[PDB]
Amino acid sequence: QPSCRQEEFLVGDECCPMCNPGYHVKQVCSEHTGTVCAPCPPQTYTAHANGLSKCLPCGVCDPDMGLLTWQECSSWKDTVCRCIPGYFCENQDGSHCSTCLQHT
Protein backbone atom coordinates (compact mmCIF):
# COMPACT_ATOMS: atom_id res chain seq x y z
CA GLN A 1 0.00 0.00 0.00
CA PRO A 2 2.79 2.67 0.10
CA SER A 3 2.99 4.43 -3.26
CA CYS A 4 6.02 4.73 -5.55
CA ARG A 5 6.60 6.88 -8.57
CA GLN A 6 6.22 5.50 -12.06
CA GLU A 7 9.07 3.05 -12.84
CA GLU A 8 9.98 2.41 -9.24
CA PHE A 9 9.18 -0.65 -7.24
CA LEU A 10 8.71 -1.06 -3.55
CA VAL A 11 11.15 -3.00 -1.41
CA GLY A 12 10.74 -2.59 2.36
CA ASP A 13 10.81 1.11 3.08
CA GLU A 14 12.44 2.04 -0.31
CA CYS A 15 11.15 2.89 -3.72
CA CYS A 16 13.84 1.58 -6.14
CA PRO A 17 14.32 2.39 -9.81
CA MET A 18 13.13 -0.40 -12.06
CA CYS A 19 15.28 -2.37 -14.44
CA ASN A 20 14.63 -2.06 -18.13
CA PRO A 21 13.19 -4.82 -20.40
CA GLY A 22 15.90 -7.40 -20.97
CA TYR A 23 17.34 -6.97 -17.46
CA HIS A 24 16.45 -8.07 -13.92
CA VAL A 25 17.35 -6.71 -10.49
CA LYS A 26 20.76 -7.93 -9.40
CA GLN A 27 20.82 -5.57 -6.38
CA VAL A 28 17.92 -3.59 -4.88
CA CYS A 29 18.54 0.06 -4.11
CA SER A 30 19.32 1.20 -0.55
CA GLU A 31 19.62 4.42 1.46
CA HIS A 32 22.83 5.45 -0.32
CA THR A 33 22.65 3.30 -3.44
CA GLY A 34 20.68 2.94 -6.65
CA THR A 35 19.48 -0.30 -8.27
CA VAL A 36 21.86 -2.74 -9.94
CA CYS A 37 20.43 -4.52 -13.00
CA ALA A 38 21.78 -7.49 -14.96
CA PRO A 39 20.82 -8.81 -18.39
CA CYS A 40 18.50 -11.83 -18.63
CA PRO A 41 20.36 -15.13 -18.91
CA PRO A 42 19.68 -17.45 -21.95
CA GLN A 43 16.07 -18.76 -22.24
CA THR A 44 14.64 -15.95 -20.14
CA TYR A 45 13.24 -12.55 -20.80
CA THR A 46 11.59 -9.50 -19.33
CA ALA A 47 9.29 -7.53 -21.64
CA HIS A 48 8.68 -4.58 -19.26
CA ALA A 49 10.50 -2.34 -16.80
CA ASN A 50 10.52 -4.46 -13.68
CA GLY A 51 11.68 -5.23 -10.18
CA LEU A 52 12.03 -8.98 -10.60
CA SER A 53 14.98 -10.80 -9.10
CA LYS A 54 14.87 -13.18 -12.01
CA CYS A 55 13.87 -13.01 -15.61
CA LEU A 56 10.88 -15.12 -16.74
CA PRO A 57 11.41 -18.41 -18.46
CA CYS A 58 10.75 -18.29 -22.24
CA GLY A 59 7.59 -20.05 -23.36
CA VAL A 60 7.58 -23.28 -25.30
CA CYS A 61 5.28 -23.83 -28.36
CA ASP A 62 3.18 -26.97 -27.70
CA PRO A 63 2.74 -28.92 -31.02
CA ASP A 64 0.01 -30.99 -29.29
CA MET A 65 -1.91 -27.69 -29.01
CA GLY A 66 -1.24 -27.23 -32.79
CA LEU A 67 1.52 -24.65 -32.30
CA LEU A 68 4.81 -24.17 -33.97
CA THR A 69 7.57 -21.85 -32.78
CA TRP A 70 7.77 -18.95 -35.16
CA GLN A 71 10.39 -16.85 -33.42
CA GLU A 72 12.79 -17.56 -30.59
CA CYS A 73 12.55 -15.62 -27.40
CA SER A 74 15.06 -12.85 -26.86
CA SER A 75 16.02 -11.25 -23.61
CA TRP A 76 13.27 -8.53 -24.05
CA LYS A 77 10.57 -10.70 -25.58
CA ASP A 78 8.95 -14.10 -25.19
CA THR A 79 8.92 -16.95 -27.78
CA VAL A 80 6.46 -16.22 -30.62
CA CYS A 81 4.16 -19.13 -31.45
CA ARG A 82 1.81 -19.60 -34.40
CA CYS A 83 -0.98 -21.92 -35.27
CA ILE A 84 -0.73 -24.51 -38.04
CA PRO A 85 -2.68 -23.75 -41.30
CA GLY A 86 -6.50 -23.91 -40.93
CA TYR A 87 -6.51 -22.41 -37.42
CA PHE A 88 -6.51 -18.97 -35.98
CA CYS A 89 -5.34 -17.67 -32.64
CA GLU A 90 -6.45 -14.63 -30.73
CA ASN A 91 -3.67 -12.46 -29.32
CA GLN A 92 -5.54 -11.04 -26.34
CA ASP A 93 -3.50 -12.26 -23.37
CA GLY A 94 0.02 -11.92 -22.01
CA SER A 95 0.42 -15.48 -23.56
CA HIS A 96 -0.47 -14.05 -27.03
CA CYS A 97 -0.81 -16.73 -29.75
CA SER A 98 -1.46 -19.78 -27.56
CA THR A 99 -4.80 -21.37 -28.55
CA CYS A 100 -5.61 -22.65 -32.00
CA LEU A 101 -9.26 -22.13 -32.78
CA GLN A 102 -11.01 -23.34 -35.88
CA HIS A 103 -14.19 -22.41 -37.60
CA THR A 104 -16.73 -25.22 -37.46
Residue numbers in the entry: 39 to 142
Pull verbatim passages from the article behind this deposition.
HVEM is a TNF (tumor necrosis factor) receptor contributing to a broad range of immune functions involving diverse cell types. It interacts with a TNF ligand, LIGHT, and immunoglobulin (Ig) superfamily members BTLA and CD160. HVEM engages in bidirectional signaling, serving not only as a receptor but also as a ligand for IgSF receptor signaling. To dissect the molecular basis for multiple functions, we determined crystal structures that reveal the distinct HVEM surfaces that engage LIGHT or BTLA/CD160, including the human HVEM–LIGHT–CD160 ternary complex, with HVEM interacting simultaneously with both binding partners.
Here, we report the structures of human orthologues of members this network, including the ternary hHVEM–hLIGHT–hCD160 and binary hHVEM–hLIGHT complexes; we also report the structure of mHVEM in isolation. Based on structural and sequence alignments between hHVEM and mHVEM, the solvent-accessible mHVEM residues close to the putative binding interfaces were mutated to dissect the interaction network and enable in vivo HVEM functional studies. A total of 52 mHVEM surface residues within or close to the likely ligand-binding interfaces were individually mutated to different amino acids to probe the effect on ligand binding and to identify variants with selective ligand recognition. For example, alteration of mHVEM G72 or V74 to aspartic acid attenuated binding to both mBTLA and mCD160, but not binding to mLIGHT; the mHVEM R43D, M56D, or A76D mutations decreased binding to mCD160, but not mBTLA and mLIGHT; and the mHVEM H86D, L90A, L94A, and L94D mutations compromised the interaction with mLIGHT, but not mBTLA or mCD160. The mHVEM G72R-V74A double mutation exhibited no binding to mBTLA or mCD160, while it retained WT binding to mLIGHT in our cell–cell and cell–protein interaction system. The mHVEM H86D-L90A double mutation showed no binding to mLIGHT and WT binding to mBTLA and mCD160.
